Structures are given as structure tokens and as C-alpha cells.
Coordinates of C-alpha atoms and ligand atoms in Angstrom, one line a residue:
Chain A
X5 CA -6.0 -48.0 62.3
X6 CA -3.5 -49.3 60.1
X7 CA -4.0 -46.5 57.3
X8 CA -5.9 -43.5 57.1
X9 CA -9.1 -42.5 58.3
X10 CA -11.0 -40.8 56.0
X11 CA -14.4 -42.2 56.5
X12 CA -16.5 -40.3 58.9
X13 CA -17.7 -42.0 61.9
X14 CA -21.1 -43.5 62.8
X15 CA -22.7 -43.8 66.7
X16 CA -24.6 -46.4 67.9
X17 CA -27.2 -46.9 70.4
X18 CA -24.9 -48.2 73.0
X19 CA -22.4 -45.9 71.8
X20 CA -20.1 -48.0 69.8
X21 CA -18.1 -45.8 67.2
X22 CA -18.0 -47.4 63.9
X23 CA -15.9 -46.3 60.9
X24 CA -13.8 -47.2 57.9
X25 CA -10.1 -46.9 57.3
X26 CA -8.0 -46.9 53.9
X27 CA -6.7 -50.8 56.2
X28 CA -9.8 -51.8 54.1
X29 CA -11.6 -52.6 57.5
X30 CA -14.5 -51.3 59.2
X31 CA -13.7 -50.5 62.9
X32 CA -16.3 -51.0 65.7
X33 CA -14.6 -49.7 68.7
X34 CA -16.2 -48.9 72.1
X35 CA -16.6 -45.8 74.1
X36 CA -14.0 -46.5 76.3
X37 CA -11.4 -46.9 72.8
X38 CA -11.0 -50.9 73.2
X39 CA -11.7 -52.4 69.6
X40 CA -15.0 -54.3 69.7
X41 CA -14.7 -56.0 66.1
X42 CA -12.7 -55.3 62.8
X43 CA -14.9 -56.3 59.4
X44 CA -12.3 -56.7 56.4
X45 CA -13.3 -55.7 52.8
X46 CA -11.4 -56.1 49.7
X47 CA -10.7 -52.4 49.6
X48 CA -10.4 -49.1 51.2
X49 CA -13.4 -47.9 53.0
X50 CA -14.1 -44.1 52.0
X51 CA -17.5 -44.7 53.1
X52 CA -19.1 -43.5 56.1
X53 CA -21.4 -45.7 58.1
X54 CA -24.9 -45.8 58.8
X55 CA -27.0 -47.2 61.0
X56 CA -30.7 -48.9 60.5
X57 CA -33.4 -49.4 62.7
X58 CA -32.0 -53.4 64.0
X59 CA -28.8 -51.8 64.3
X60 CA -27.1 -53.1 60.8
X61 CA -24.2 -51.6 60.3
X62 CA -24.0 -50.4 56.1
X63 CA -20.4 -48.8 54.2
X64 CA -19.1 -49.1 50.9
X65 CA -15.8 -49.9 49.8
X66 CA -13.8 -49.2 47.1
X67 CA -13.9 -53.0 46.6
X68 CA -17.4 -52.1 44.6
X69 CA -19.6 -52.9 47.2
X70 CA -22.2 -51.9 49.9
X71 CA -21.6 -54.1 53.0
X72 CA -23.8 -54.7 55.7
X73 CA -23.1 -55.8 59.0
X74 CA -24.5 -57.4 61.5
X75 CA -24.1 -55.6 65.5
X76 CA -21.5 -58.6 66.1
X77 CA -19.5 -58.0 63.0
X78 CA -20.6 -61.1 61.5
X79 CA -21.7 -59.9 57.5
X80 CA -25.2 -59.9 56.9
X81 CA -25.1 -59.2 53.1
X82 CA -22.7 -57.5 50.5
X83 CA -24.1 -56.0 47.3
X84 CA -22.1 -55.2 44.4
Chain B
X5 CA -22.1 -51.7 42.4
X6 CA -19.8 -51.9 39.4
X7 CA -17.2 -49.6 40.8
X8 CA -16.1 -47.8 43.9
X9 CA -18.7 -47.0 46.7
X10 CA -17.2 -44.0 48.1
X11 CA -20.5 -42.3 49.0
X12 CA -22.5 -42.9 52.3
X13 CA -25.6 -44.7 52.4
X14 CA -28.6 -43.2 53.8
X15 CA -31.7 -45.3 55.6
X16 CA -34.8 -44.6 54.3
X17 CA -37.8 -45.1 56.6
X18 CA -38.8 -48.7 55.4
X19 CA -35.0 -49.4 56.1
X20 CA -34.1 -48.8 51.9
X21 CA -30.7 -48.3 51.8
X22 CA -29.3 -46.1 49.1
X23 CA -25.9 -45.4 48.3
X24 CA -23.8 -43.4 44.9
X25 CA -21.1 -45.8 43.0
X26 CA -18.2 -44.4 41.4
X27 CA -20.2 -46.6 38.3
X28 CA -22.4 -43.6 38.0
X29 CA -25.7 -44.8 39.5
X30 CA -27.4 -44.4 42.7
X31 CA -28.2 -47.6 43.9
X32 CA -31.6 -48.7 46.3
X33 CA -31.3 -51.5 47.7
X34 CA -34.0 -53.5 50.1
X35 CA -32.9 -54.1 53.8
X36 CA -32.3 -57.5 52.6
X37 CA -29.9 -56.8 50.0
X38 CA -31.9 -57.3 47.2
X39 CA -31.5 -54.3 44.0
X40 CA -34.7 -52.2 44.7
X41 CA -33.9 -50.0 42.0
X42 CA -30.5 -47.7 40.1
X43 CA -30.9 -44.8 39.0
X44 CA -28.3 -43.7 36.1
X45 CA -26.9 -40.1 36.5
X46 CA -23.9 -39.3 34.1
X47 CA -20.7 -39.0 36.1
X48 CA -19.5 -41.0 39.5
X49 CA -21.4 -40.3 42.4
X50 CA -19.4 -39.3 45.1
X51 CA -21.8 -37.5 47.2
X52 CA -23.9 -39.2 49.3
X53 CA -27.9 -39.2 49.3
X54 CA -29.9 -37.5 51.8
X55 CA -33.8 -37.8 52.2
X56 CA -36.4 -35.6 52.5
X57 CA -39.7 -35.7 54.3
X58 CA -41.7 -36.8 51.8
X59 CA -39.1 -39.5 50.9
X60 CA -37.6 -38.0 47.6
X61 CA -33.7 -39.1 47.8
X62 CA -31.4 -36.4 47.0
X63 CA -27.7 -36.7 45.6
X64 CA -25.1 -34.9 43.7
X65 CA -23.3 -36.2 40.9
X66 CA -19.9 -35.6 39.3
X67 CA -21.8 -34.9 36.1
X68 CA -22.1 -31.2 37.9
X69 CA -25.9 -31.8 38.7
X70 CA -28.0 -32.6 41.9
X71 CA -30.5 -34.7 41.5
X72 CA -33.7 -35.2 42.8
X73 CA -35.2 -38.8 42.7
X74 CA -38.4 -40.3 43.6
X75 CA -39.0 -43.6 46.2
X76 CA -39.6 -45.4 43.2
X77 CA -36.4 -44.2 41.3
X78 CA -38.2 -42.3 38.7
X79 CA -36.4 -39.0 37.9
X80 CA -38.3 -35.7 40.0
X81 CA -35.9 -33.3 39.0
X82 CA -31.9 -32.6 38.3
X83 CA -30.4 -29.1 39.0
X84 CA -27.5 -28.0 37.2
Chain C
X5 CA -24.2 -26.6 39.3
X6 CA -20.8 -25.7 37.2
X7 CA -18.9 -28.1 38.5
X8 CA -18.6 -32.0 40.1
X9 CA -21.3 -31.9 43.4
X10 CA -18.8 -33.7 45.5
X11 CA -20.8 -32.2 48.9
X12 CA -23.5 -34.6 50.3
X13 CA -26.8 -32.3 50.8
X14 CA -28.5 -31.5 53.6
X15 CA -32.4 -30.6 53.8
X16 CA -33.8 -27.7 55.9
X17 CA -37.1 -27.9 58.4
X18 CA -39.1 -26.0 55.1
X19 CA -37.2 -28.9 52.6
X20 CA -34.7 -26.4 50.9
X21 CA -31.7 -28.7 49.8
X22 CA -28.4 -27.1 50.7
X23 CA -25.1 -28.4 48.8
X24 CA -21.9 -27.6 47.9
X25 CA -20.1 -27.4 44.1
X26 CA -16.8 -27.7 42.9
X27 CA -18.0 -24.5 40.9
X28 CA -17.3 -22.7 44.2
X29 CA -21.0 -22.1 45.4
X30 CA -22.7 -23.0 48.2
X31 CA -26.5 -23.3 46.5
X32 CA -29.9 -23.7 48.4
X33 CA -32.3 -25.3 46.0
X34 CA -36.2 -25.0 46.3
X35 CA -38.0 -28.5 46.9
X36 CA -39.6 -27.9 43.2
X37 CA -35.6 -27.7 41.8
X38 CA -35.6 -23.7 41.5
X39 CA -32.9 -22.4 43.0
X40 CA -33.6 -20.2 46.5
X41 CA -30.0 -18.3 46.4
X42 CA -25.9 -19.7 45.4
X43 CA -23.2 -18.1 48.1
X44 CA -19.4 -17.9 46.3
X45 CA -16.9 -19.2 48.2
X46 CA -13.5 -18.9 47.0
X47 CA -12.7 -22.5 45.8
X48 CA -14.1 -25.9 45.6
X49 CA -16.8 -26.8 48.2
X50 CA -16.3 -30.5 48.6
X51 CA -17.7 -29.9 52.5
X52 CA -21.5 -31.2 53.3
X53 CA -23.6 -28.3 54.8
X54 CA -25.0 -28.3 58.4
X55 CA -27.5 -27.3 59.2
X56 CA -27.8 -25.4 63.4
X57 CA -30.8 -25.3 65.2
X58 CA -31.5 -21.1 64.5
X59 CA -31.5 -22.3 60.3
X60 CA -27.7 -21.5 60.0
X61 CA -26.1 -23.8 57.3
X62 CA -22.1 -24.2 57.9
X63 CA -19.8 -25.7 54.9
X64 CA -16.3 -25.8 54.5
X65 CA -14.7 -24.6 51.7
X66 CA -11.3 -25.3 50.0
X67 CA -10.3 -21.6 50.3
X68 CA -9.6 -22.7 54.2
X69 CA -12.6 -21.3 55.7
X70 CA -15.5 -22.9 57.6
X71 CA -18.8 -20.7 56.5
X72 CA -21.7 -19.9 58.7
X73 CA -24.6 -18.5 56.0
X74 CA -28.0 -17.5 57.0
X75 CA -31.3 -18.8 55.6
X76 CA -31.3 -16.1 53.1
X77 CA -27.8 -16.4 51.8
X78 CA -25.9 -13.3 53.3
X79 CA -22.7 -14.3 55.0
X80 CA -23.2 -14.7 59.2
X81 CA -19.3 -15.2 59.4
X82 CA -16.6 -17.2 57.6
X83 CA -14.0 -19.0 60.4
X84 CA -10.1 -19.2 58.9
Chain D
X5 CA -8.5 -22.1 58.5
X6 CA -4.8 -23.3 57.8
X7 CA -6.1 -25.2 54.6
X8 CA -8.8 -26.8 53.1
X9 CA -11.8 -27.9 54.9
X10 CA -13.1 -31.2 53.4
X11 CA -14.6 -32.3 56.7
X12 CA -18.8 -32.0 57.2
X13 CA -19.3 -30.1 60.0
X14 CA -21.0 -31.3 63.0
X15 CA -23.3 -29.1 65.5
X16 CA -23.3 -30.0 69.3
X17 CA -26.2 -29.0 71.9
X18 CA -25.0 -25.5 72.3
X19 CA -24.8 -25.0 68.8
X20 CA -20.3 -25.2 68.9
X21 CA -19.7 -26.3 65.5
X22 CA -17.0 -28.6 64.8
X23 CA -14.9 -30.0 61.9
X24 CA -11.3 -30.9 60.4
X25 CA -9.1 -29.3 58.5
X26 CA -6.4 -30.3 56.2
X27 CA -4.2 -28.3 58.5
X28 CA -4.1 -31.4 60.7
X29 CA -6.5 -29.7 63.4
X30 CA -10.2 -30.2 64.5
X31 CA -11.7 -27.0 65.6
X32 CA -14.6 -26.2 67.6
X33 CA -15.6 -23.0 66.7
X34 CA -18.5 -21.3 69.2
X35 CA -21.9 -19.9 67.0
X36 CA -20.9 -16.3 66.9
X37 CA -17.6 -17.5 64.8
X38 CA -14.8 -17.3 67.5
X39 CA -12.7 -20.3 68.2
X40 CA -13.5 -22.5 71.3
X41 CA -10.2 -24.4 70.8
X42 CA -8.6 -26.3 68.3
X43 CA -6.9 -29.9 68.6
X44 CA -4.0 -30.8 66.7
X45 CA -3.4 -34.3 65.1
X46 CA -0.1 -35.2 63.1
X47 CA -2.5 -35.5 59.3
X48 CA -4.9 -33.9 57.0
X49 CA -8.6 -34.3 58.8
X50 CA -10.6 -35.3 55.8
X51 CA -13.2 -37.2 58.1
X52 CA -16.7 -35.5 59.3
X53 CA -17.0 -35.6 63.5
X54 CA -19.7 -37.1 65.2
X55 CA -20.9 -36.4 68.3
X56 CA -21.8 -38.8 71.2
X57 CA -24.5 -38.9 73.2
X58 CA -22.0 -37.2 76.5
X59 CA -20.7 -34.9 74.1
X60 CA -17.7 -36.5 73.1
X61 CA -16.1 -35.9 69.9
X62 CA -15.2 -38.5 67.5
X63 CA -13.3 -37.8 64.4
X64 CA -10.6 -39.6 61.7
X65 CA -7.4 -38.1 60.9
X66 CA -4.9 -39.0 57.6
X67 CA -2.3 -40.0 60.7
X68 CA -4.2 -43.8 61.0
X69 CA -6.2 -43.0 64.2
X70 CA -9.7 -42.2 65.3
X71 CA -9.4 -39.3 68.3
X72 CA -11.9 -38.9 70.9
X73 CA -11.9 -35.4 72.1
X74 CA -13.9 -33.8 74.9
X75 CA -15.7 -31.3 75.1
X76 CA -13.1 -29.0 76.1
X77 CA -11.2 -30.1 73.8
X78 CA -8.7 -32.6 75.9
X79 CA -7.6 -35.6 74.7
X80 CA -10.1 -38.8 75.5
X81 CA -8.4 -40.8 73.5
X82 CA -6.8 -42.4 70.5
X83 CA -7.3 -45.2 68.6
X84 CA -4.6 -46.7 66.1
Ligands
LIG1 CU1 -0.6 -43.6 56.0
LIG2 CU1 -5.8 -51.1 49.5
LIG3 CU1 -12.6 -50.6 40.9
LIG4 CU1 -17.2 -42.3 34.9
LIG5 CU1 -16.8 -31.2 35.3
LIG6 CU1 -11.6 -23.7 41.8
LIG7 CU1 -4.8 -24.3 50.4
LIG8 CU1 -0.2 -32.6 56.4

């Protein structure tokens, strides 16, 4: 990504590999490696991903808050 | 939260999402990003919370204890 | 514990909480919050446990080594 | 290992046990504690693998990219 990795990543159903980067992004990136979506957040994300039931997508930041994402990477909600 | 997310969030089974905040609580938060409960520990909470059978949500806190908390985010027991 | 809990727990098939301490020690807990056993390691344990299917709980340490410890808390192996 | 071990490990169907090290490597170490091989990247790997539903490897590494290893612990591939 465009900084480090330190977030650990999370697997979807259909096998997408989602996970944060000190960029301040979250990464969704299919198995074959092709990016599927970037989300950008205000900060880096330390976080690791998890996944609910309908497939949201949830990782803090170090921007304060707990994002969630929808499956498309459109954002669903943010909490701070 | 009021301060860096760095812990992960964990599902519960009715899709609660909880998550540590550098601010020093462990946040619940409903599937529709509405505050479910906090929960104050006394140090930033870096670790990230994992759930047991019966739902209790465990988590570590920089105040040097793990705590123990119920679904309803009444205190069950903290370990130093 | 004696230090920052830094490591994210993990939960055993009998509920026994397994997490790691900047103290050093890799503790088991009880599900009533008495401690089962603590395993020193040689530094910080900012590693989360795992957990393998025979009941062996792995952590990394920040001596360098990756520990296997049985159920009981006697070293299986430590990996440098 | 060569350094610290911050990374979770992560347990795969025949019980090989894998995490990073701030050495730069991931290893995959077999159950009875002997390596199964180790794969260099060029920074500290802070981040937890996950494992896919084929067996691949995912993991983060302080040098910007998410690697995808094999089983046998060949490159899949990279992500920047
Ligand atoms: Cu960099
Ligand atoms: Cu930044
Ligand atoms: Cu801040
Ligand atoms: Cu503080
Ligand atoms: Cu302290
Ligand atoms: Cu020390
Ligand atoms: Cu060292
Ligand atoms: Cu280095």
C-alpha cells in the first residue's frame, strides 16, 4: 500500500482480503491481488477488520473512529 | 470514540460490534451504529475484545488488567 | 497482570481466557477470573494466543520466540 | 526467532502455525516445533496472517505490501 501494513488481514466470503494500512486506507483486494476498492479515513488504520453476518466490513482508525463499510466500499456508518 | 481505535472489533452474535479506544473505554456499539453501551477501564485499550460462549466480552487494558464484561456492559470481573 | 495487556485474548473449548502481558507472562484465566496457571516468557508478550485443534495455545513473545504451551502450562516447545 | 514476535499466530488445517517476525520473515513452523519454511519480506511483520479458504497465506509487512504466500511457502503474490 502506500505505508505500512500493520493491520492484520480479514477474509471474506468470496475471498476478498481486506486490511488497513498506515496510507490511512482500508484495502479490499481480490484473490487474484487486483485491488477491488480503497476506503480512506482521516488516519492510520492499526485496526484489523472484521466481518458481520451481511458482510459489513468494521476497522478503527487512529482518526477516533470505528468505520463500517458496506461490501462495495461505499460507508455505511462511522462512530466516534 | 474519543481517541485512537487501534483495537479490533469483534461481532457479537446479534451483530454488536465492540471495539477498545485509546480513550480508555470499550465501546458497544449496535449494527446500526448507534452507542449500545462504554464501558470505562483505566488505561487505553489496545487489545482487542474477544467473546465467549455465553456472550461475556473479554479485553485487556493498558491499566495492566483483563477485564471481563457482561452483554449489558456491567462489570463481571477484572484480573490483574 | 503486572503490566499493559497489549495481547488480544483468546477463549478455549472449556472458556479458559488465554492472554499475554507486558509483565512477561502468558496467563490462562478461569471463566470465574481465578487464574488456571501464568507461563514466563522472557519479555513483553504483545502476541495474541492461538489456540490448535489438540488445546495447544501459541503466542509470540518479544524475547524472539514463538511459544507452543500445553493446556496445563508446561512448555511443548518455544520456536527462535 | 531473529526478533520480536508481535504477530498473532494463525493455525492452518494441519495444524502448521504461522506468524511474522520483526526479523522481516513469516514463518510456518510445523506442530512438533521444526520450521516448514520461512519467507523473507524487506520489513518488520507486525501484522497477524490469515488464512484462506485454499490455504493461502495472507499477511502485512512494515515494507507497504500485503504478501500472499502458498502453502509451500512460494510467492503468490504482492500487493503495494
Ligand atoms: Cu514506510
Ligand atoms: Cu497519517
Ligand atoms: Cu487522536
Ligand atoms: Cu490514557
Ligand atoms: Cu503500567
Ligand atoms: Cu520487559
Ligand atoms: Cu530483540
Ligand atoms: Cu527491519
Amino acid at each position: 500500500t502506500g505505508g505500512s501494513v500493520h493491520s492484520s488481514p480479514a477474509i471474506g466470503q468470496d475471498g476478498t482480503i481486506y486490511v488497513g494500512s498506515n496510507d490511512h486506507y482500508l484495502y479490499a483486494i481480490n484473490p487474484n491481488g487486483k485491488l477491488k476498492w480503497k476506503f480512506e479515513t482521516g488516519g492510520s488504520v492499526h485496526s484489523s477488520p472484521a466481518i458481520g453476518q451481511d458482510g459489513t466490513i468494521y476497522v478503527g482508525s487512529n482518526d477516533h473512529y470505528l468505520y463500517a463499510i458496506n461490501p462495495n466500499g461505499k460507508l455505511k456508518w462511522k462512530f466516534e
